Amino acid sequence: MKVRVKAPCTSANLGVGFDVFGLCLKEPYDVIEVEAIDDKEIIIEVDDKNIPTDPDKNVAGIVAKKMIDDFNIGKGVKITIKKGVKAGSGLGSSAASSAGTAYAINELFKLNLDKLKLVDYASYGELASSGAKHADNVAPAIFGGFTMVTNYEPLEVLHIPIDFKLDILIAIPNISINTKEAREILPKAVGLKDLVNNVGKACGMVYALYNKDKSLFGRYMMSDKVIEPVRGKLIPNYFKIKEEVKDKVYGITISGSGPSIIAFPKEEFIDEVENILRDYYENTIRTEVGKGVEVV
C-alpha cells in the first residue's frame, strides 16, 4: 500500500512575473515514497541531514497531516524523501516536497482531487514553514509547464502548457538565501512607471508563450528594474555572467529568490553557455520544462 513519486524543482518570478509566474523544471527533483501504515502517526525519513524529520517541521509531514485530518483517513504514513536540491537555493526545494506529498496522498488514498486543490494543500506546507502560503512554486510543481498564480483568497492558478522545446540551464551557487532574507531586501514601494513596465512586459511574456516566441519571452523577462537589480547583488558574478552570455541566450535571470540563475540558451550556443556558467559555478545542470509531479 504505497506510492512513489518524482516531484520537480521549479523556477518562480522569472523577472517581471514576481510572485505570479512559475516554470516547472524536469530536473532536479525529489523522489518521495509514501506508505500507508496502521500506526496513526507520521514518520518521515530524509537523505539530507539539514532537513527536519519532525512531522511538524518537515513540510511533507505538515501536508500529510492536514490531508489525513481533512479526509478523516485512518492509516498514518511513512514518508521517505530523497532530496533533489538543497533548501535556500531558489529552486523550490521545499515546494517539491510539499507538492509531491499532496500528489502522493491523493494517489495513495484515491481522493480524486483536482490539481488546484493539490496546489492549495501543498501551499500549507509552504506557509507553516515560511509564514506565507505562497503557491508560485507549488503551482508549477503540480501543473507542469508555465503557471500564473493570479489570486490567493481563493487560490486561482492559470496553466499554460509548453509544448515546444525550451532548453534550460541552471547555475547553483554554494551560498543560500533563506526566503526570509529574501523579502526584507524587497522594496516596500514601487513607482507607477515600474508597475506599468512590469505589467506590460509580463503580459508580453504570456503573448510570447502563445506565439511560441522565445526571443520575446526572454527579452521581456529581463526587463525588471524593481526587484532583480536588488537581488542580483546577492549573487557573485551575476551581472558579469549576464553580460558574458548576452547574445547567446534568449534570456537569463534569477530563479525564485535566488541564488540560483536560470538561463534559456539559444540552440546554437547551448554548450558554450553551459561552460561559461560552469566556469563560475560548478553545480550547473542542463534541463528543460517539466510536466509536474508524476508517479514513478
Ligand X SMILES: Nc1ncnc2c1ncn2[C@@H]1O[C@H](COP(=O)(O)OP(=O)(O)O)[C@@H](O)[C@H]1O
Ligand Y SMILES: Nc1ncnc2c1ncn2[C@@H]1O[C@H](COP(=O)(O)OP(=O)(O)OP(O)(O)=S)[C@@H](O)[C@H]1O
Ligand Z SMILES: CC[C@H](C)[C@H](N)C(=O)O
Q: Are 147 and 241 in contact (CB under 8 A)?
A: no
Amino acid identity at 237: N
Cα separations in angstroms, 107 against 33, 104, 150, 153, 292: 11, 5, 27, 26, 14
The catalytic residue among 10, 101, 179, 287 is 179
- Identify which of residues 61 and 251 has a Cβ nearer to ligand Y in the complex: 61
Which positions from 69 through 128 interact with ligand X, judged by CB under 6 A? 81, 87-88, 90, 92-95, 97
Q: Are 253 and 17 in contact (CB under 8 A)?
A: no
- Identify which of residues 42 and 94 has a Cβ nearer to ligand Z in the complex: 94
By CB atoms closer than 10 A (0-12, 13-18, 19+), residue 27 is middle
- Identify which of residues 74 and 187 has a Cβ nearer to a second copy in the complex: 187
Break-preceding residues in the chain (C–N over 2.5 Å)? none
**Shortest separation between residue 14's beta carbon and a second copy, angstroms:** 11
Extract the annotated binding site: 86-96
Extract the annotated binding site for ATP: 86-96
Residue of 40, 57, 165, 183 interacting with ligand Z (CB under 6 A): 183
Residue of 5, 8, 9, 18 interacting with a second copy (CB under 8 A): 18
Cell, residue 95: 515546494
CA angle 134, 17, 210 (to 5 degrees): 115
Stretch that binds a second copy, among 97-105, 163-171, 191-199, 233-241 (CB under 8 A): 191-199
The catalytic residue among 33, 126, 228, 274 is 126
Residues 95 and 126: their CA atoms lie apart, in Å, by: 7
Q: Is 179 a catalytic residue?
A: yes
- Identify which of residues 13 and 98 has a Cβ nearer to ligand Z in the complex: 13
What residue 178 binds from ligand Y, Mg ion, ligand X, none (CB within 5 to 8 A, per partner kind)? ligand X
Which positions from 197 through 236 interact with a second copy, judged by CB under 8 A? 198-207, 210, 220, 226
Give exposure, 52-81, as e/b (b: 16+ Cβ within 10 Å).
Answer: eeebeebbbbbbbbbbbeeeebeebbbbbb
Which positions from 225 through 284 interact with ligand X, judged by CB under 6 A? none
Residue of 14, 42, 67, 95 interacting with Mg ion (CB under 5 A): 95
**Shortest separation between residue 267's beta carbon and ligand Y, angstroms:** 28
DSSP codes, 209-222: HHTT-HHHHHHHHT
Cα separations in angstroms, 273 against 15, 267, 284, 289: 20, 10, 11, 18
**Residues at the site binding ligand Y, with contacts judged by CB under 6 A:** 46, 51-52, 57-60, 81, 87-95, 97, 129-130, 137, 179, 256-257
Cα separations in angstroms, 125 against 100, 143, 175: 11, 17, 24
Q: Are 205 and 162 in contact (CB under 8 A)?
A: no
* Residue 53 interacts with ligand X (CB under 6 A): yes or no: no
| Contact positions vs ligand Z (CB under 6 A) | 12-13, 18-19, 134, 136-137, 179, 182-183, 256-257
Question: Which residues are at the interface with ligand X (CB under 6 A)?
Answer: 51-52, 58-60, 81, 87-88, 90, 92-95, 97, 129-130, 178-179
Q: Enumerate the active-site residues.
A: 126, 179
